[PDB]
Ligand binder design. Structure first.
Ligand SMILES: CCCCCCCCCCCCO[C@@H]1O[C@H](CO)[C@@H](O[C@H]2O[C@H](CO)[C@@H](O)[C@H](O)[C@H]2O)[C@H](O)[C@H]1O
Ligand SMILES: CC[N+](C)(C)CCCS(=O)(=O)[O-]
Ligand SMILES: CC[N+](C)(C)CCCS(=O)(=O)[O-]
Lengths: 184, 187
């Protein structure tokens, strides 16, 4: 049931933003007793945090498939492109992730989950860049991730300015910049 | 003037509780006016939100246009992009509300239009600066620079204590350095 609720929340949020994800609306979409929800989560914020944790765990599993050695540029691109709205699935994910990032302004649990998530991805990016002798690796890693997050935010609210082919070109350009001075 | 007072109340509510807290009734309550007074100016909550967003983007663009460009592009780019970073309380509030509207833009055509126009305007100015100095891939690097400030602002929302102004300014300086690599400039 809690997994079902997390999927149902993501589904509502992608459709109608997080303002649509009332305890009531999430129940309809999964099955389930409005009490069944209350059984698993004592607060709405608990329910949101669980959904975010689910989305993050799925993202990290995806990074682990695509970021598997060999050419650094291609690995960095495959990983960062998971965060960009390049198809309908990733457009929904980007929408929901951005929504959680704004909701973190008023929710310490969501802010902490995001902080740990960014720390994890950033450390992974840093390890890649250090391994190839990149100048200012850690700072550049932070910048790569921040820039990808910003591109995703910019794109969801203005898709005509950020078609997938443009997003892919912009990510290529950013990666090329980050790798300047690396070997290779 | 009256719609402007309502836009200011909306911003005050949104900076506190997000845009979820910015119902017509909550905005009316914060402004000290009747629901009827609000509905008089705004036919819909959409129109209320769009007007508030326009008010905000006007303020931001006015600040960007006040940047002294002079003869040093790195300095000008830093001064301009610093205005879009949460380096103090006022800009932290602006970041929170602007990010909220960006997210709402995913489902609201009126907000998307205002966001698109804003991004187009800013990218155009940044591209002019970069082309002016022979920056490789100037247009895309302009879009990347703007994305950097947007992404850094987004993260600083949830963890403001961890993104102090000096961290944000350092990150921005490093990105500008990368953006200017291969441009006709003299460091
Ligand atoms: C220093 C180096 C880097 C420099 C970076 C430069 C950034 C450039 C910003 C300055 C330009 C501001 O110019 C401003 O553009 C916006 C469009 O976005 C216009 O605004 C127009 O669209 C908006 C948004 O839909 C409406 O709310 C507004 O009523 C309408 O007039 C303003 O009428 C114009 O005065
Ligand atoms: C005609 C007067 N001006 C200020 C130009 C436009 C009025 C519409 S407004 O206030 O919503 O920009
Ligand atoms: C409501 C408080 N928020 C912004 C969610 C968390 C603060 C995290 S902090 O202290 O590291 O900036």
């Amino acid at each position: 049931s809690p997994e079902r609720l997390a999927a149902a929340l993501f589904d509502v949020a992608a459709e109608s933003g997080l303002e649509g994800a009332s305890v009531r609306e999430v129940a309809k979409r999964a099955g389930v007793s409005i009490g069944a929800v209350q059984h698993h989560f004592s607060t709405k914020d608990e329910m949101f945090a669980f959904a975010l944790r689910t989305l993050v765990d799925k993202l990290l599993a995806r990074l682990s498939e695509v970021e598997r050695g060999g050419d650094p540029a291609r690995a960095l691109f495959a990983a960062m492109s998971q965060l960009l709205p390049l198809d309908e699935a990733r457009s929904r994910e980007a929408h929901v992730m951005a929504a959680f990032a704004v909701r973190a302004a008023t929710s310490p649990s969501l802010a902490e989950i995001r902080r740990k998530t960014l720390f994890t991805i950033r450390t992974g990016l840093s390890a890649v860049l250090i391994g190839i002798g990149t100048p200012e690796a850690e700072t550049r890693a932070a910048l790569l991730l921040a820039t990808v997050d910003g591109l995703a935010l910019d794109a969801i609210g203005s898709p005509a300015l950020y078609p997938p082919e443009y997003l892919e070109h912009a990510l290529d350009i950013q990666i090329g910049m980050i790798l300047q001075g690396a070997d290779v």
